[model samples]
Target: NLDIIGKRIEKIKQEHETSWHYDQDHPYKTWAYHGSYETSMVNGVVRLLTKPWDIIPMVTQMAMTEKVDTRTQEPKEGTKKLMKITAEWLWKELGKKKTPRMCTREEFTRKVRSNAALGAWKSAREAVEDSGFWELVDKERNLHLEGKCETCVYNMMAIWYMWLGARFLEFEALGFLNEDHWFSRENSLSGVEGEGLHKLGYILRDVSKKEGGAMYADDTAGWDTRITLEDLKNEEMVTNHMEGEHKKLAEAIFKLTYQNKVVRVQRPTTVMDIISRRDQRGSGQVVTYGLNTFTNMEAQLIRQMEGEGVFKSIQHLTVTEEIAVKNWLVRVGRERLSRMAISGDDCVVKPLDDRFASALTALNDMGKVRKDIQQWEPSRGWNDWTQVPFCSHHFHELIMKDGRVLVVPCRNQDELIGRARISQGAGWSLRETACLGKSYAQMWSLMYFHRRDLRLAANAICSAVPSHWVPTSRATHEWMTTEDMLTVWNRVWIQENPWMEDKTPVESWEEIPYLGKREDQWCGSLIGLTSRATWAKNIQTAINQVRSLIGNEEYTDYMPSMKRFRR
Candidate 1:
C-alpha cells in the first residue's frame, strides 16, 4: 500500500507538470526588468534548501509564528504616552521614599543602546554621537528643538517618538513600515525574491563596472565609491549621497518627522490628537490611494509618512499620469469601435462584425493601425493598446487610396481629444485624474476580464470612480444626499464577420505582483478631474449594475453607489 501510494504521488506530479517558455507577448512580460544574477540563484537555492526539511513540521511551526498588526487602532485616551507617565509618577509617589534616582547621562546612553524601545534610533544615535548633534533636544525640551533641529536632529526625533516613545507607550511604530537602517538595505534590494534592483547593490555594481571588475568579487573594487566616516560628518554630503527616488523618500521622511514635532513630547500634545489629526479630512486616504500598487511601495510608504507630517501634502508617482491616460484612452477607443460595429463609416471599415477596435484601419502618418499589420509598436506607449479596455484586437489601421479613407479601428475621436488635451498642458488636476483613473480602471478591468462579464467590468469601473473621486471622510453627507437623473449609455460589441484568426489568445487579468501591502488600502485621492465627464457618468451607471448583480451582499454601503452619483 505504501509503495502504491508513493507511485501514485509521483504519477500525479508528472501529470501536473507542464513546460513553460518566457512569453514576450504575455501581459506581465513588460513588468520584468533586469533580475539580479546572485538574487536569482540565491532564491532558487533557498527554495531548494527549505524543501528538504520536514514539510508538516515546517507547516506547523510556520502557522505558530505570531503576526504583529502594525496598523494604528482606535486610541483610548490614556492608553498611550500619558499612561506611561502617570504609571511612572504613581510608582514614585506611592512606593520609594529614597532619593528617587533619574537616568544618568551614561545610563541614558546605555539605555538607548540596550532598550528595544530605543533600537530604532540605534544608527541615528551613532550619527548623533559622532556629530555631537545631540544637544538639540532633551527630555524636558529645554532646547526648543524646532529651529535648532536640522535633518539629522529631525531623524533623531523620529527615532525618539516613533520608536522609543511608541514602544514605551506600547503602540505600534508611528510610521507605516518598520523603518529600515539607512545604509543597511539602502543600496540593495530587500531579501532575495523581491523584484527590481536594490539601490545600494546597483550603485556598488556601477562602481565596480567603472573599474572593469565585478562587485563583491573584487576586494577593493568599489572602495572609492564608499561613503566615508568623514563624508557622513557632513549632513549635506550625506543627503547628497542618497540619490534616486530614495533621496526624495528620505527628504520626505525628515519633513514629516520635523513637522509633527513628536520629538519633544509636544502638541498636538497627546498621542490621541496626533493620530486623530493625522487622520483628519481623509488625508490618510490620499496617501494610500496614491501608493496602493505593490509596484510602488517605497513611494507609498513615503507618502504615508508625509500624511502624518508638517502641513500635509499627498503626492503619487509621476508614472501615474501616463498610466491613467493610456488606460482611459484605450477605453474610449474601444467604446467608439463598439458603437461603429452596427453601422459602416466612410473613414473606417467595420471589418467583420465581431472585430476589435484594435483591428481598425491603417495609419495615415502617425502610428495608427493598418488594415492588417504583422505587428504594432512594442514600446511603452503602444503596449496599453494591447492590454487595456479590449484585448485580442490588432491595433494597426488600414488606409484606402484614391481620396477614400477605409480606416481601421483604433483610438477614436474622444480618445484622440483626451490625448490631445493631455499633451497640451492638462496640469496636475488632470494628471491626478489620470492617476486615480488608472488605479480604479485596472480594478474594473480585472473583474471584467476575470468573469468575462461586461456588466461586472462596467460596475467595477464605474463604482471605482466615485469611491475614489469624491471626498468621503472629508465631511458628513450634505450635498452627499442630493439627487439627479442623468442619461448613461452602456453596450458591448462582438464581431459577426469572424474574418480574423486568433493570433494572441486573450488572457484573464492577473493581480499585480506582491498584492498585499497595507499601504494600498490606505491611500485615497480626492477628485482633481471633472467627475461630470461622460465616461464618469457611464462608470456610475455600471456601478449601479454591479450593485444589482451582487445584490448588496458584497457591496458595502460606504462604497459609492450609482444613486449617490446621481445626487
Candidate 2:
C-alpha cells in the first residue's frame, strides 16, 4: 500500500541498538564532534532518561515514592517545616480542648502521595517512567556535574524535559485528540496513522536534537548544564518536563492533522499589509525581501517542472524591480492558465483585476479553488509566512506528483538564486519545513505576539519595522526587540539550522523560556516552517492536475474534502 520508506528505519534501529549513538550502550559525546560518522546518523544527544528504571517503576517515583516519617508523622526536610506551622496554627485556632494530631512523617508523605490531586502527578510521572527510555546518573559521575559542569544543570534539566516530555505528551495529546471531533480518523492523518511515524523523524532530528547541548555554549553564565541531585529529585521539574514537551508534541500532531483534513487550499504569491501604525511606516524591507525570495523560488520551481516537461518555456524573464510584484503574479497566473487545458478542468485560472496588494487577501476571494489557509500549516505560506492568500495556482507544483526528479536550491541566495528548484517532490514531502524552522519562528512570534498584543502573525508583521530604517518617532525597544529576537535566534532557531554553526554568543547567549531544565517544547523549536493546510492544498492541486492530465480514475478517489484536526 505504501513505498515503505519508514520500515527501513525500524530495521536499522534494531540492527544498530548498541551501535546507535542515541543508545547509551554506544554513547557518542557530541553531534558536532562525532568522529567519522555519517552526518545524518551522528545525532549526538544525552539527557535524563524519561523512562524510569525498573527499581523505581516510574520517573515520578524519583519524586513521589518518598516517605514522610511515621513516628514524627512529618514531611521530610522543607515540607515538614511548612507542615509544623500548619499543625500549630490549627491547634491555636481550635483552642483549649483540641490538640493538632500529627501523623508520623511517613504517614503524612504516604497520605499526600495517595491524595487524588497530588497522585495525578504521580500517575502521569509514572506513565513516562514506565517507558524505559530514561536512566539515572552514577554517584561517581556526580563529580562531572560540579563546578563549570554546573552549566549542564540547565542542559540536563532541559534534556529531561525534552525526553520525558515527549513521552508524556504523546500519551496525553492522544487523549485530547480522541475527544476532539477534528481528531476523528476520517478527519486526519494522525487519527488514522498516528503522528508517531511522521513526527518521530521530527522529534528525533529536530525537537530532541536542540536539547543535546549542541546549540548553546557549554558554560554560559545563565545556562547551567549540570545535572544536580536536587533537580533529579524534584517532582515538579520531572512532571513539568512531561507537561511542556507534551504540549509541543501535541501541537505538532494536531497542526499536521488539521492540514491533512483540508478540502480546499489556495495561496497567492504575496500578500501586502497596509501599515496602520505610523511607527511601522518603513517596514517594507521584510515585504520586499519576502516577495523577491518567493518569486525567485517560484521561478526556480517552475524551471524544474519545465525541465520535467511540465511546461515548454519559462516565460516572463525580463521582470524589473519596479514591476516585480506584477511580474510575479502574472507569471504565476499565466503558468496556471496554461495548465487549464492540460488538466481538462474548469475555473483553474481565476484572477481578480482589483489591485490587491497581498496574496493572502487575494486568496480569500478564491472560491473557485478550495483549501483552508487560515489554519497554521507549514505549506500554506512562504518564508516564515508574513501572510496567507488564496490561489491554487500559487502552489500548483505541490499538487503535481508523478515522481519526477526534483532539484533543491541551496539556502544561500548567491549560490542558488537562478538555479533549479531544490529538487522537492512536493512540499509535504519536506518535514519541519525542511527541519530549519519553527520554535525559532513560532516561539519568537508567540513571544512577539504575546508582548505586542497582536492577533495574528500578519498583525505582528504589520507592527514590525526594519531595524535600519526606524524613524525618530519610534525607539528600537518600542517597536520591536531585535536583541530579544536574536536571543531566540542564536540560542533557539539558528541552533537548529544544520548548515549554520552553533551561534553561541560571543560572551554568553542570553536564555530563552527554559534556561537549563530543558523543556522539550520550550527548549527547541517544534513549529513547522509553513502551515500544513497550505502545503496540503498545494499537493492537492498538483495531484488533481496530474490525475486529470493522465485521465486516471484515482482523481475521483480524492474528491471529498478531508477534515483537519480540532482547532
Candidate 3:
C-alpha cells in the first residue's frame, strides 16, 4: 500500500514536469511593458490585454474622473481631461518604480524563443511591438507633456491595441496554466473559441452522457412588465385586470416578488421554468452555442415560434429585434461613409482578405454581445461565435424566487472570457463616452457601438487559443449542471482547491520560469468571470445611464449626437 501511494506521488510529479499545463515565469512579465504606459506616454497609449482582471482597475484608474453636474468647456479643469489627469497622477504615483527599458522587435522575439516555457507566447509578444502601434498620441501634438487636447476618441484604438498585446501574452501563458485536467473541458460549454486550439478544438466535443441546459425562453405563457404597487396592494384588482396568461404570470411574479421592483420578463424564462424542466428531462439536447446580443441561431428559434401564437406578447425588443440593431449599424456606417466621402476619404475600399480586416471593419462600424450566445459558420472556414449579454448565472438563478437553488452550472466560461476578453478591452475605449450623456438612447448607442468593436475584436482573434497552443507539448470539458456537476474537477489533483472555490487564490506558485504555482484559474477563471462580468458591468452602467436620464420616469431630452440618429 505504501509503495502504491509513493508511485502515485511520483507520477503526479512526472506529469508536472512534462505536462504543458504548468506554472510559468516572468516573461508573462507585467511591469516590463504594461503596453499601456508606452502608448499613453510615448506620444501614445494602449489596450488588447494582460492580467485580465487587472483591466478593470486599470481602466477605472485611467478612464474615470471626479463626478460633477456637467461641464463641456475646454480644459475647464474637470472630467474631460480625465485620462490626462489620471496619467499624470499615475506618473507621480509610480515614482517608486523605474520605467522599463524598451525591447526591440528582434530582442523580444529572441527572448521569447530563448524560454521554452514561454514558447507559445511568441505571437503575443510579436503583436506587442512588432505590430508597431504608436505615434497617434504624437499626432495629438503635445500628448507627451499635456496640452489643451483631451485625448481623442481614436486614441481608444491604440489603447485597445495595448490591451490586446498584454492580454494575448497573458492568455498564452494561461493556456499552459498549471491546473488539473478539467471535467468542464470534457463539457462542450468550456471550449472558448481560439483558446489553445491545437489542444482543445474550436468548439468542445459533445461528450457529456447526461445533458440538458437549454433555456426557459423556448416557450412562454406570455410577457409582462412592471407589476404595480397598486396591483400588489389589491391582489383582486390584478386578478381582474390581467387576463388568462397575464393572470398566471402575475401570480408567478407575485410569488417571486411581492410586485416590488417586479420585472415580469416573459423574455428570460429560462431564468425560470424551462431550465427547471431541463433537469427533469435528463438526457436532453445540450445547447453548444452562446453568441451575440441574440444567439446567432435565434432565427431558428423564431421559426419554431412562428408556428406557435405565444411570441406576440414580447414587447419592444422581441427576440428577433436584434436584426434591427444590425440595421442601425448599417445606417450608422453608411452615413459615416457619406460624411467621410464629403472629405474624400470614403471612396477607397477594397481588400484581399475578406475573412478578417473587412469583416472586422464591418464590426468596427457596426453595433451590438453574448449576454446572448450563438455560433456562426465562418464565411469560408469554421463556426464563428458571439455572446449576447444578460447575466449567465443571474438569469439561471432568477428562478430561485422559491429558493430552488442547486441548479448551479457555469457553462460558457471561456466564451464569456473569449469574447468579453475582446469586448472588455474594447469597452475600455468607450470608457469616457459612457459618461458623456444621460439618455437611454445615447447610452445604448455608445455601448452598442462598443459592442460592435467587441464583435470585431473577438472575431479578429477568435481562432487564437484553439489554433495556437500545440497539444503535442500537451494541455487540456464537461457538463453536469449547477447541481450534480460538483465533482467534475477532482479535489486532490493538485495541491490546491479549484480556483473559484479557493478561499485565497495566489499570484505565484509554478516556478518553472516566473515563479511556482500561481494560484488561480481565478486569475484565469476571472478572465471569463469578467467575460460577461465585463459585459454585465457594461450593460449595468448603460442601465444606470438610462435610469439617470429618466428623471421621475416621465421624460428626458435626447443628446444631440444620438438625436439625429434617425433623421
Candidate 4:
C-alpha cells in the first residue's frame, strides 16, 4: 500500500507539534547575520536614510487605507499619525517647490519611532523584546541600539506582523485565485536555493563587500555574507574607522556631477509621491519572486471579501510600450534566474500517464482524451482530492501533478462562488476547504470560477505577468504568484522565439479581449514581431497580387468570412 508522505507528516504534526510550522527554526538564527556580530546593520541604514524625505514617500499610501481600525477596518490611529505627518510634510515640501529638510537622521529616527511606538506600537516593540536581542546590547562590549534605527524599525515592523499574523495555509486557502486556473511551476529558481542568492541576502552581501567589511559568507558558509555590526555600529560612538577607507574606494561611484550636488539637497515631495505610489502599487514585490511556488492568500481573501470592488485597483498596458515593460521584465527577472540556479529546487514538466488516464480513450473510437478515476489513492500516485472517497470526477484542463485548483478567469461575483476545478493530485486547497463542507464536484454549481485583477511584471503581455514579482503583497492575479510562472519563464518562456525565427524586431503590441460572451471572458494579443518596414513591403506584394486578379478593386470596404465547409 502506498501513502502520501505529506499526509503522514502532516498527521504526525497534528498529533505532536500542533502544526507544520511549530518545529521550524527562526531564520535569523539559521541565516548569515548573527545577533552579536551584526548589531549595527540597522543603525547604519538609519543614519543614511531616516530623513522625512525618505520616510514620507514610504508611508503616504497609508493615508488612503480607509477606516483602518474601526468598524471600517483600517490602520491603527497611532500608525495613522505618522502617516499624517508624512503627507503634510510632503504637501508643504511640494507647495514651495523646494526640497524640505527637517530634523536629523538620528533625530528623525527617534521622533518617528517614539510617536508610532505609543498606544498600539504593540508587535513592533514586542518583536524587539521577545527576540532577546536587546539583552545582547545590555551586556555587549561594543554596540547597542538607541531604539530607532530605521532598518531596525522596518525589520521589527515586519517581524511583528509576521509573528502576530501569517498565512498559515488555511488563511490563504480561505480566499480565491486571481487569474486563469494555472500557476505554471516551470521556473522557480533563485536566492533561497542551493547556489542562488535571495534578493535581500544578495543586497546585504554586496553592501558589506563594497564597504570592504568581512562580515558575510556563502550559503551556510560564505555565499550569504556577514557584516557583524560594522556597517551600523561603531566600536566607539561615531568613529567610522574603516568607513573612511570604504568611502575612498567607493569614491569613484560618486564621480557623476549630480551625485554630490543632489546627495545633500532635499528632494521635492511631488517626486516623492511618484516613488511611493509606484512602490505601493505592486503589493508583494519583496517576498515571493517565486522561490517556492505558492498562492497569494491575502489577495484571495480580499477577492472574497471585497466582491466587485477588487477591480478598483485594476490597471492595464500592452504592445507599443512593450520595450520598456520588457526592460523591467529582464531587470527584475535577475533574481528569479539567480534562484533558478539553486541546486535542489524542483519543477517537473508532466507527460502522458494514467494520472490523466492514458490507456482508455473513447468507446466509439473517437478519442476524447480523458482521465476518469472512479476511486483515488495517494499510494497509487493518484490524487485523493475533493477530500473524499466518493464522487467520480474529471477535469478538461491540464497543469501540474501536485497542482491544486484550476482557476478559470471569471469576473461575476455571483457566478464564481464555489466553482473552481479541484484536483485530487493538487491536494491542499481541498483539505483546507473540507472543513467548510465544500469539497465535492457533486453538483454542476460546485466549480471555482475565479476572478481577475492584475498588477504585473512585463506590463505589455497579459500571459507573462508575475504573481509575486516584488516579494511584498503587491502583485497581480494570485495564482501567478506561484513559483510555476517563474519556472516556466526561466525554463521555457524567456528564450521563446516566435516559430521560424524571424530576425526582425517586434513592431507593435496589440491586445483584443471580449472574444467570448462576457466582455472579460476571452482575450488575445498581436505582437508584430515582423518589422513595420517589412509589413509595408508585405502589403505592397499582396496588393500587387490583388491588382493582377481584380484590376485595382478596393478590398478595404469588404468584410469576408470563411467561404468553405467540409462535407
Candidate 5:
C-alpha cells in the first residue's frame, strides 16, 4: 500500500512536470499594442472596442476646429487619434515596468519557426488601414465618421494603424497563451480573420487547433446608450396594452418597435403569422390584395413596355386591376417612406378620385395585427392602437438594456495567471502591488489583458455562449398567461447560469492561474457557481429591460427561478 501511494505521488509530479514542460515549450503570449497613451493597454483595448472606429464618440470639441475636405462634420476620424494615444500609453506603461520587450517581429518569427515558445501574429493594421473598409461605411447612419478635416483624418488613421498593430500583437501574444495541453496552439478569432487577411495558411499549419478566441482591437469602441427610465416606461406601457385588450394592435405597433430595436425573431406559426400579419389593417389590406393580384401581370406589362420602341408611346395601365392593387398595397405598406420626410413626394404618385388618399390620416393612426390574423382587418372598425415594446431573454442576458455588452471574465485555471503570478512570477514587473492593481484596473477595463482574453473566449466557446447573442423572445403581455412555458424557460436559463458566479477566491489565490484538473472531456463541468451568478445577473437585467419596455405587471416568470441566487 505504501509503495502504491508513493508511485501515485511520483506520477502526479511527473504529470505536472510534463504539463509545465509543454506549456513552457509553447508559451502562449497574449499581448496588446496600442497607438495612443490615453488609456492603459488593456483599458484601451476593451473600452475602445466598446465602439468601433466607424462609430466614433459624439463630442463637440474645437481644435482650432479645422474644416475637413472629406465632406462631413462628424469626428469619427477622431478614433484614430485615440488609438495612437492608447498605443503610446501601452508602450510607455510597459517600459516603466520591467516587462520583457516582445520579441521583435523578426525575432518572434525565427523563434516560432524553430518551434520556440514564442508565437508570431500577423498584424492586420496595414490591410485595415489600406483596405478602405471605412469607405464602405454609410456616413449618415454612422455619425462618428462625419468629420471633414485633415486633422480628423490624422486622428482616425492613427487609431486605424494602432488596430493594425494590435491585431498582430494579439495574434502573437495569444499564440503564446494556453499553457495547457488540451487547448494549446489554437487560433484566436482575431487570428483566423488575421490568417484570411494576411494569408498565414502556411504558418497556421504548425499550430494545433484553429478554434479561435475572441478578438480585441484597440481601435474599436462601443457607443451604446444606457437604458433610460423613459424608454422603460414607454416599452412597458406599450407591452401592457398589447397583451391586454389589444393584442392585435399590440403586435402591430410592437412589430414596428422590434424592427426599430433590431430584435431577431423566430417563427412559431407560419409565414402569414410572421410577415403578412403586419399588413392586416385598412391600407394594408388594399396593398396586400394588390400584391396578390398584380405581380405576374405587372411583370408582363413591364416586359412589354421595355420591348416597346423608345420612340413609341404605350398605354401604361396594361396590367390587371390586381396589379394596381398590388402597387397600391406596396405603397401603403411603405407609407413611412412616403411621409415626405426621407423620400420626397416621388415616394408614391397619385391618381385623381383617390379620396382614400387620406394617406396623411392613415399615417396619423396605424394599427397592429395579432395572433388571430383572420379577424384583424381595417374594415373591422379597428381604431389604430399604440403597441408595446418587448425584448427576448437571449438579448437581455447578453446585452445590457442600455446597450453595454456584458461579458464575464474567463475562469479557467491554466490559461489564467494568479495575482501572485502576475506580481511575483515570470510576468511580474508591474512595480508595486499598487501599480499592478492600477494596471489590472486599467487592463480589466480595456481589451484582453493577460490570459483573460483566452479565458473569456474559451468560456464563451466551450459553453453555449452567444456571439453577440440577442433577444429571441421575451415575456410580453401577449404570453403572460402561459405559466408552464415561462416556468420551463426560466428553469432552463437558471440551470444554464452564464456568468462567473463565485467571486475570485481570496486575493492571495488571485495570481495563480486555475489549471483545471483532469475531468470528463477536457472541459471541466461547471461547478454551478457561474450558473448561479449568470442567472442572477440575467434576472436583474431582464426585469429592468422588461419593466422599462412593458409597464410592471403582477407576474414575473423569472422571479421564482431567480430566488436561488440570493442564497
Candidate 6:
C-alpha cells in the first residue's frame, strides 16, 4: 500500500513538470499554459506533503494577490482596476490572510517534482485496519446520521476512520477571447451563413466521462449533476427565440415580395440562410431556394443597373414587376421602342393598355439607351453578397446613368457597436469597425429584443465569472439561468461543499461587478450573494424544496405503478 501511494505521488509531480510551457507568443499562448500558473509547480509539491483541502485556503489567498494576465504580459490602463479593488476588498474584509508568494513558477515545479521522488514507506504490520468502511456506507446510504452514529464524536471518528485519501490527476483549463468585434469567431451558435446561430439551448456532454469517470448508469444517481432544470429550459427558450425571429423575418420579406400572390413556404429562411442559398451553385427548383432569394436577387439586379449607386429611395427601387423591369426590356424589344416612338400603340409591345401608352415616353428613352449600351448578366455572381451590415463591401454607393448617386442605408461601425453595446449592456469594449460584424450583431439584437429574460440571465452569469475564464467552462452553457450561476459562483469561490444543496446562499449582496455599488440597487433585478455560509444554507434548503416539488410533478405519471407497489 505504501509503495502504491508513493507511485501515485510521483505520477502527479511528473505530470506538473511536463505541463508548464507556452507554445505561442505571450498573449496568444496555447490553453495549456494556465496549468503552470493556476495549478503551478509549488501546488503539486505542497500536495505531496499535505492534504488537498488544506492547501485550498492558501491557494485562494495566492490567487487573489498574484493576479496575472495569462494572454498579454502587459498591464491595464485603469487606476485601481475592478479586479484589484475587488480582490483588495475581499482580502481586507473577508478575514482571509494574505499568503505571500515564496517561490517562482520554475522553482515551485522543480521542488514538487523532487519531493514526490523521495517516497514514504510503511510496513504491513503498521498499516491501519479498515474496520467499518462497509458498516458506515451501508448506514449512510440507507439511513440518516441519527439512525447510525450516536454522537458528534462518533460521527467525526467514523469520518476520520474512513481514512479518506486522494490523488491529484492532471489539471486543465479552457480559454475564450472576448472582443469588441460584432461577431464572435468562437460562438458555436453563430456559424457562417447563419447555419449555427439558432440552436435550441446548449448540448452538454459529461465532463466526468471526458475525464475517464464511470459510465453513466440508468438511474438519475448516475446522471451528470451539472445538468440543471433551468439550463435545459433556457436552452429551449433561446432556441425558440432564435428560430421564431428567423421565421418572422423571412416571412416578412416573403410577404413584401409576393404581393397578392399565394406561395407555400417549403423551408426555414433566415437572413444568413437566404444569403447562403443564393451563393450556392447548381440550383434546381425554386422550392430548393429560400423565399427571400428571389426578391433579394431582384434587388441585386436593380443595384447592378444603378452600378456603384444602389437605390436611394422606395421610388427609385426598380423591382421585377413588369412595369418596373425597364433595364432588360430595351435590349429584348427594339421593335417595341420604334412602335412607342410612332403611335404608343401595340406595334411590338407586350401590353397595349392606356397606362402603357401613358408610360411610353419614359420607357422608350431607357429602351433606346439600352440598345446603345453594353448588357451583362445581372444574376451571374450576386449570390456572393453577405447580408451582414458590418461587411461594408456589401452595401456599395450606386452611380446612376445620370450624375445622381445614391447612398446605401447601412449603419457605419460606430453606429452599430454603439447600439449593440447599449442593447448588450456594459460588457462591450473597443471600437474597431472590423469587430462590428453585422449578422451576428443583428442576431444578438433579436435575442435581447424579444427575450429580456435571456439577455439579463447572460449578463449576470458573464459578469459574475472572471472575465479571463471561458463562461462555458464554469457552467453548462453561455445562456445559463441565474439560479444555476449562483451555484457555479459558490463552487468557484468556496472549494468545500460544492454541491448546491450544501452551500449557504445570500440572495441579496452588496456588490456585483458592473453593477453599481449600492445594497439598494441590484444588478438589473438579479441579486448576488454576499458569500455568507448561513444564507447559502437556507437558500440551499429552499432550492431543494423546489427541486422536490418539480421531481414529484415529473413522476406523477407513475401513480399507477406506485399504487400497485403500495398494495
lDDT head-to-head 1 vs 5, winner? 1
TM-score of each: 0.17, 0.15, 0.17, 0.18, 0.14, 0.16
Candidate 4 Cα outliers beyond 4 Å, as residue runs: 1-349, 355-567
Give the whole-model CA lDDT for all candidates, comma-separated.
Answer: 0.23, 0.22, 0.22, 0.20, 0.22, 0.22
lDDT of 6 at 558: 13
Q: Taking the tens digit of each residue's C-alpha lDDT, what string does model 4 give over 285-358?
A: 11222211221111111111122121122122223333333343345333222212122112111111222222
Which residues of candidate 3, in runs, are more than 4 Å off? 1-77, 80-83, 94-99, 104-107, 110-567
lDDT of 6 by residue, 1-567 (tens): 222122323333355565443223333121112112112112221111112222234323432321111221112212112112222322232112221121222332343343321111142112213334335433422322122211101001101111111000000000000011111212211111121212111111111112221211111111111112221121122112223333232222122211111111111210100000111111111111221121121222222223312222323233343233342333422222211100001011112222222221211211111222233311111111122122121222323233332222232222222223221223333221112222222232222211222223223222222223321100012222323333443343223322223334424211111212231122121124333223222332333342343233211111111122123
lDDT score at residue 122, model 6, on the 0-100 scale? 44
Q: In model 6, how large is the Cα lDDT of residue 23?
A: 27
TM-score top scorer: 4
Candidate 1 structure quality by residue, lDDT tens digits, 1-567 = 222122323332344346212223222221121111110011111111122122324222432310110122332222122222222322232222222121234444554454233434355346335423333333212212222222211111112323332121111111221222111122112111121111112222222222111111101112111212121121112223344443444343323322222211121211111111111111111111111111112111121122222112112223343343334323432332222111000111121222222221111111111223243421111122211211111122122122221112222212221221221122334224423333323323321221212222223433433333331110011212112101000111112112223223222122111112231112111112243233344543545553453343333222232333435
**lDDT, candidate 5, 173-257, per-residue tens:** 2222112111111211111111110112122221212222211011001101111212112222322322322333233222322
The C-alpha RMSD of each candidate to the native structure, in angstroms, is: 29.1, 32.1, 33.0, 28.7, 31.0, 33.2
* lDDT comparing candidate 3 with the true structure: 0.22
Number of colliding residue pairs in each model: 43, 72, 73, 65, 75, 16
lDDT of 3 by residue, 470-490 (tens): 111001112111111113222
